[PDB]
Structure 1
Amino acid sequence: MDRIIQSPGKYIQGADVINRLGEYLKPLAERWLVVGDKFVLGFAQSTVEKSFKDAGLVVEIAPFGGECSQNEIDRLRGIAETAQCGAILGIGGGKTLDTAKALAHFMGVPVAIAPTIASTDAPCSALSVIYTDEGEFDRYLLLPNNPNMVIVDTKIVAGAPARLLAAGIGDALATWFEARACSRSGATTMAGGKCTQAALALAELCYNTLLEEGEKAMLAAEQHVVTPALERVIEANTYLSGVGFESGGLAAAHAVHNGLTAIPDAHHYYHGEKVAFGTLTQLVLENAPVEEIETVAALSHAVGLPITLAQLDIKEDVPAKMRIVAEAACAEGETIHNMPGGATPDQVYAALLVADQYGQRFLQEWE
């Protein structure tokens, strides 16, 4: 069929770049509503308003309620209309950015996304994961276009807990392996077409960047300072992993992540930490070479990601729980079917237990 690649129109990243929000956003619109994370605004609202004023723009700073509900979308739209805003800027965590994207869609205005943590691949994407109130996956919610601009302040991001950066590494570690399987299987990407050569290049660039700079970036994040290794990992976590998964395809890792949410044991863990184990489960499922799985297992453990089920607090009734996880992964419309050859709930259940047994041996041999 057709080959399609989607991208945000502009990706900018740099230290203290929120000082330049005004100059970068001015071409898009003149009247902006800012849906700001309460924590981000507590320490930076002054400089955001100054950045806009110095560029001759008008702002309506709107503290984000916290949840990405339709109530909150409606409330924010009223503010935006009363102020006659022509574009939305979301700045903060994922729930903040997902709201800004939904708002600007309903208002048919351009959107700017400014993540303040590099913990998932969601920002650049034209997507949204819809979740039941029990913490279990439901559906992917698509949007007609990607954000117009993504702006990443690497100094703000370096301030977050390093666990968040590692969770982004976990979500990005999957990119190459799931896009590669979609290429092998002739699967359709979330952009609606076959793989381009470009998307597969970025997905493989993502994986290699994490291998070469993951541990060094983790060192800078713990000190909350910016080094070039950190910059590269933030780009891998945001642009590369975003364009890679959307335009290269999802497969077993994210299906296993959605399957893990169907049990409450790992509810208190981040997206990327569950994806980290889904990658390892995909490598067993597709019988990756022993050298490949050892590398992925070693980098994952080197940044604190879980490589066994106990590290996601799954410790009792493991078999019963893994049947639920496996059936959930194989549900209708799930991405596990993009695996070369496909996968059966008996097959995913096997890989779960075997990935776990492999992770346990690696932690033993590391001592």
Structure 2
Amino acid sequence: AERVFISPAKYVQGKNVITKIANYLEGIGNKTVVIADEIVWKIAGHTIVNELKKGNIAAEEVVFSGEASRNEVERIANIARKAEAAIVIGVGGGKTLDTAKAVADELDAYIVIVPTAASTDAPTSALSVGVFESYRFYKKNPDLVLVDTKIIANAPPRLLASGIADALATWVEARSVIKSGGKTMAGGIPTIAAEAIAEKCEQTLFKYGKLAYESVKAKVVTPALEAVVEANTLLSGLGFESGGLAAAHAIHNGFTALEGEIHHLTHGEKVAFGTLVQLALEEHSQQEIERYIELYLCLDLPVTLEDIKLKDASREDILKVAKAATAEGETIHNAFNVTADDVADAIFAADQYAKAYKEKH
């Protein structure tokens, strides 16, 4: 079997790096399109445009509607066409970054991804996704991912905790794919590079995660925050894409089978619970499971069905989640041979294990 590793061309992370944007685009082009929603234009959008102007780089300001639909992409791509911009700059959260990637594919443009929170590991990836249907690949991983830690230190602590949750799934999922001989999102078995990256991701989070969370609460940049932002973005990104997905993200996707307040949680908050479910489907001792539960609690992340807005959910409701999670083509099959009923049982088990832990402290 062939091993495959893919990656964005360049990843740059540091305090105030947003100010050198004109610098990194020098020998690339002098015309760009900048995509952000209303809030983000105030947070970083104008700062970016102003930095590009200083360097004589034109910039068409686009206000993202807030929905990553084909129409919005078509609308934005037209604007870029007319402005004849060769560089797409997406700034902000998930939906904006995905839209920007779709836009860049239409135009065959150089794409710069500028996250304003380290909340998911979508930034460096070549893939995207009310009910989940499938994963789709873009033509490439992003050309430049620019991560400004000063910006992230000012984003809500809840968003850093969410990114830690999403990154904590990386080693759990990749390890299960490596052990089962399964395939990664990249198409082949995992490389040793991805295994090393994924395992280091977990180590970095257990070591610095709480200190990074406190740093954000005080809105300061520290070595601990720099370490966790890299884990949440570069390690988690490469780890999941080239290391492999399994049950945790399948459960996250399964939640789309339900309607309700659960959908106000972040991707990371849902993945935290999904990760506990994967651990309940594996052979771990009580102490190994509690090591994760303890960390989630110290980051104010959800660990019970009640925490994810599914208090007293019925077996039938959980079964819908399980059926969606075990749909043909889901990632859970890359590491497990389970039925929807096994998965439904594991969801209730994880809830019971977390409650048992809580009723001990």
TM-score, length-scaled by structure 2: 0.96
Q: CA deviation at 1:328?
A: 1.2
Distance 1:246 1:44, change over 3 A: closer
Matches within 5 A, 1:251-290: 251-265=246-260, 266-290=262-286
The answer on whether the counterparts of 1:126 and 1:143 sit within 8 Å (CA) in structure 2 is: yes
Corresponding residue of 1:329? 325
Distance 1:317 1:38 in 2: 37
- Counterpart residue type for residue 158 of structure 1: A
Q: Secondary structure of the equivalent of 1:168?
A: helix
Corresponding residue of 1:308? 304
Give percent identity, aligned residues only. Answer: 49
Q: Secondary structure of the equivalent of 1:315?
A: coil
Q: Secondary structure of the equivalent of 1:170?
A: helix
1:100-128 Cα distance to aligned partner (Å, 9 max, x none): 10000011112110000111111100001
1:186-213 Cα distance to aligned partner (Å, 9 max, x none): 1111111111000111111111111011
- Alignment of 1:23 onto 2:40: no
Q: CA deviation at 1:50?
A: 2.8
Matches within 5 A, 1:199-278: 199-265=194-260, 266-278=262-274
- Counterpart residue type for residue 302 of structure 1: C
1:348 to 340, 343, 350: 343
- Counterpart residue type for residue 361 of structure 1: A
1:307-364 Cα distance to aligned partner (Å, 9 max, x none): 1110001013332221111111111001111124x11112111111111000101112
The answer on whether the counterparts of 2:17 and 2:146 sit within 8 Å (CA) in structure 1 is: yes
- Counterpart residue type for residue 142 of structure 1: F
Q: Secondary structure of the equivalent of 2:145?
A: strand
Distance 2:5 2:207 in 1: 26
Q: Secondary structure of the equivalent of 1:111?
A: strand
Structure 1: segments with no counterpart, 5+ residues: none
Q: CA deviation at 1:183?
A: 0.4
- Counterpart residue type for residue 67 of structure 2: E
Q: CA deviation at 1:47?
A: 2.6
Corresponding residue of 2:105? 105
The answer on whether the counterparts of 1:171 and 1:275 sit within 8 Å (CA) in structure 2 is: yes
The answer on whether the counterparts of 1:37 and 1:93 sit within 8 Å (CA) in structure 2 is: no
Q: Secondary structure of the equivalent of 1:35?
A: strand
1:21-70 Cα distance to aligned partner (Å, 9 max, x none): 11012233321111123212224444312321333322222122211112
Corresponding residue of 1:75? 75
Matches within 5 A, 1:89-104: 89-104=89-104
Q: CA deviation at 1:145?
A: 1.2
Q: Secondary structure of the equivalent of 1:5?
A: strand
Distance 1:283 1:23, change over 3 A: same
- Counterpart residue type for residue 160 of structure 1: A
The answer on whether the counterparts of 1:8 and 1:124 sit within 8 Å (CA) in structure 2 is: yes
Number of aligned residue pairs: give it: 360
Q: Secondary structure of the equivalent of 1:62?
A: strand
- Alignment of 1:178 onto 2:173: yes
The answer on whether the counterparts of 1:326 and 1:348 sit within 8 Å (CA) in structure 2 is: yes
The answer on whether the counterparts of 1:30 and 1:57 sit within 8 Å (CA) in structure 2 is: yes
Corresponding residue of 1:188? 183
The answer on whether the counterparts of 1:174 and 1:275 sit within 8 Å (CA) in structure 2 is: yes
Deviates most, 316-325 or 178-187: 316-325
Matches within 5 A, 1:2-21: 2-21=2-21
Q: Secondary structure of the equivalent of 2:198?
A: helix
Distance 1:3 1:203 in 2: 16
Q: Secondary structure of the equivalent of 1:118?
A: coil
Distance 2:4 2:18 in 1: 32
- Alignment of 1:163 onto 2:158: yes
Distance 2:12 2:322 in 1: 39
Distance 1:46 1:317, change over 3 A: closer
Deviates most, 320-329 or 45-54: 45-54
Distance 2:56 2:46 in 1: 16
Distance 1:122 1:44, change over 3 A: closer
The answer on whether the counterparts of 1:34 and 1:90 sit within 8 Å (CA) in structure 2 is: yes
Distance 1:319 1:196 in 2: 39
Q: CA deviation at 1:290?
A: 2.6
Q: Secondary structure of the equivalent of 2:142?
A: coil
Distance 1:32 1:304 in 2: 40
The answer on whether the counterparts of 2:306 and 2:312 sit within 8 Å (CA) in structure 1 is: no
